[PDB]
Design a protein around this ligand. Sequence first.
Ligand SMILES: *[C@@H]1O[C@H](CO)[C@@H](O[C@@H]2O[C@H](CO)[C@@H](O)[C@H](O)[C@H]2NC(C)=O)[C@H](O)[C@H]1NC(C)=O
Ligand SMILES: *[C@@H]1O[C@H](CO)[C@@H](O[C@@H]2O[C@H](CO)[C@@H](O)[C@H](O)[C@H]2NC(C)=O)[C@H](O)[C@H]1NC(C)=O
Ligand SMILES: *[C@@H]1O[C@H](CO)[C@@H](O)[C@H](O)[C@H]1NC(C)=O
Ligand SMILES: *[C@@H]1O[C@H](CO)[C@@H](O)[C@H](O)[C@H]1NC(C)=O
Lengths: 49, 49
Amino acid sequence: TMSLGAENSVAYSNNSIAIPTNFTISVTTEILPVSMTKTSVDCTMYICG
Amino acid sequence: GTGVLTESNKKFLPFQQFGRDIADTTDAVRDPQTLEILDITPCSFGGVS
Ligand SMILES: *[C@@H]1O[C@H](CO)[C@@H](O[C@@H]2O[C@H](CO)[C@@H](O)[C@H](O)[C@H]2NC(C)=O)[C@H](O)[C@H]1NC(C)=O
Ligand SMILES: *[C@@H]1O[C@H](CO)[C@@H](O[C@@H]2O[C@H](CO)[C@@H](O)[C@H](O)[C@H]2NC(C)=O)[C@H](O)[C@H]1NC(C)=O
Ligand SMILES: *[C@@H]1O[C@H](CO)[C@@H](O)[C@H](O)[C@H]1NC(C)=O
Ligand SMILES: *[C@@H]1O[C@H](CO)[C@@H](O)[C@H](O)[C@H]1NC(C)=O
């Protein structure tokens, strides 16, 4: 059975807050297609010979 | 068939007669005389704009 995710629990209370003291500059990628290959066909040359 | 006949380097086996492409059309053929081996290629063609 696939592991749905890493189990975690955050300590919540109604008078406590958590504030970062440091940062981290991260770089991520993302690939997106734009245009495929333009194609054309010949009717008679294909249907006939 | 209509096409251009050129010298071919294909090493036919002695019993082999034709040569077929992906579309099962005779690509390389053996002439009855001289037992020569040829290539059959459609003549130059294309689109006009
Ligand atoms: C700030 O303090 C709170 C409580 O004093 C921390 O919350 C606990 O964290 C431990 C970590 O091992 C857990 O085992 C406890 O279950 C948490 N408490 C509760 C009530 O769930 C909190 O982690 C602290 N902050 C940081 C950044 O460590
Ligand atoms: C915030 O994080 C950075 C990197 O995680 C800390 O910079 C490191 O500091 C230690 C000790 O000064 C060095 O040995 C490392 O080489 C540093 N890393 C880099 C990438 O420069 C930085 O100290 C953290 N902020 C604070 C306030 O401690
Ligand atoms: C936070 O919740 C507890 C009950 O879990 C309650 O007793 C307490 O009064 C709350 N805090 C405040 C500031 O009201
Ligand atoms: C026909 O071609 C073959 C192949 O070279 C040759 O051996 C034969 O003599 C030819 N016969 C005639 C009648 O041209």
